[PDB]
């Protein structure tokens, strides 16, 4: 979560209908845009961010929210438009002993500006005494590891998250969905459409 990936999406045709089959039940909260009307208008640039967090923390990924992941690991702007997609993945990222590959920052001097990355691993001095790199008193290592286990409850099982962000610039839109088609007819008074020509 702390080192959340960033991917650029541009110059493509995107079909969002496929995303409804990820899982029988998965959150699909969309902010500022109706999910069913994502195949009509289109944007200039699309950003996709993917990571893994605890299922209960999934409520902290939303505009105007506060918590620990929200202000220390991943913050969304108040005036945010896009969608968030999260589904259960306990079958794919769980170890009986416990997974340790996922880390999250726990201590930070201040909050996080929306859409900011902080990968620093320098020790956190809680108190006034400078420990200078030893995990003793008032000095704790900021990174903590999710100990994912299939025996955990639904409130602690891993949940994969993919966040889509959209916006408009003066550049022409290129990331637009499919337009479908219909078989041709001839020698009959019919209504026709040819690349937006009524």
């Amino acid at each position, epitope marked *: 979560v702390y080192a959340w990936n960033r991917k650029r999406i541009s110059n493509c045709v995107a079909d969002y209908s496929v995303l409804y089959n990820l899982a029988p039940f998965f959150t699909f909260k969309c902010y500022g845009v109706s999910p069913t009307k994502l195949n009509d208008l289109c944007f200039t640039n699309v950003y996709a961010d993917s990571f893994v967090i605890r299922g209960d923390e999934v409520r902290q990924i939303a505009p105007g929210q506060t918590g620990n992941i929200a202000d220390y690991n991943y913050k969304l702007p108040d005036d945010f438009t896009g969608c968030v997609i999260a589904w259960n993945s306990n079958k794919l990222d769980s170890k009986v002993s416990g997974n340790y590959n996922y880390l999250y920052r726990l201590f930070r001097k201040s909050n996080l500006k929306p859409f900011e990355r902080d990968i620093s691993t320098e020790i956190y001095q809680a108190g006034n005494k400078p*420990c200078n790199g030893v995990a003793g*008193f008032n000095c704790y*290592f900021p990174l903590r590891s999710y100990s994912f286990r299939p025996t955990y409850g639904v409130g602690h099982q891993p949940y994969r998250v993919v966040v889509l962000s959209f916006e408009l610039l003066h550049a022409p839109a290129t990331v637009c969905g499919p337009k479908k088609s219909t078989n041709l007819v001839k020698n009959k008074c019919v209504n026709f459409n040819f690349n937006g020509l009524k």
Partner: antibody
Amino acid sequence: QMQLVQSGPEVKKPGTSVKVSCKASGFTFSSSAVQWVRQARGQHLEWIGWIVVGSGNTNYAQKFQERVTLTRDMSTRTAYMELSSLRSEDTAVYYCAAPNCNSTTCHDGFDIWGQGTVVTVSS
Amino acid sequence: EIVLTQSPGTLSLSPGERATLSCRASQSVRSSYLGWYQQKPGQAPRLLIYGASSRATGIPDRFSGSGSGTDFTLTISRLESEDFAVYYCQQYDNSPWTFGQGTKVE
């Protein structure tokens, strides 16, 4: 008010297990730490172990590292001890100490202390 | 791994004078990771000197530590009836934490 309230004295028998905990209130308990010590009547204090509430990483004394456990819970903001393999020489008063914090900077060292629990092991 | 020898075991001074307390460590310890505790008979210990030179909240001004290199010392500049108790010191380094034998003042 900054305070550490602890449980009451308990009496058990050798070969059984004891569970002692102290409740914390009056300060930011998210970034504190707790250590436990024991002291018999007329004897010197002996360190047992410590654990970080916000991390859970625990360090034990070399002598007792095979018979001490440390657990903590966020909702009830409580530090727990479970001690197994009781002996007649385990009759001592146990204390829990935590530093002071203000959600910005924490106190250097353990300042406040609990009331103490008197435990006797006999048959 | 860390031994803090304490001497003398017993102290006998009358109020109105100045008493001396010393916790001598067997190795090199940083000044920011040691503390001194005083407890009344039967009462829980309280923190008196942390960092070997800085007092805590509510600590009387009569107390003033020395904070040497490896042999810490606490000199009491003024004695009161409350100060008659047992004293202990602890080390906070990476080694397992140990306590002193205890100094008793009469």
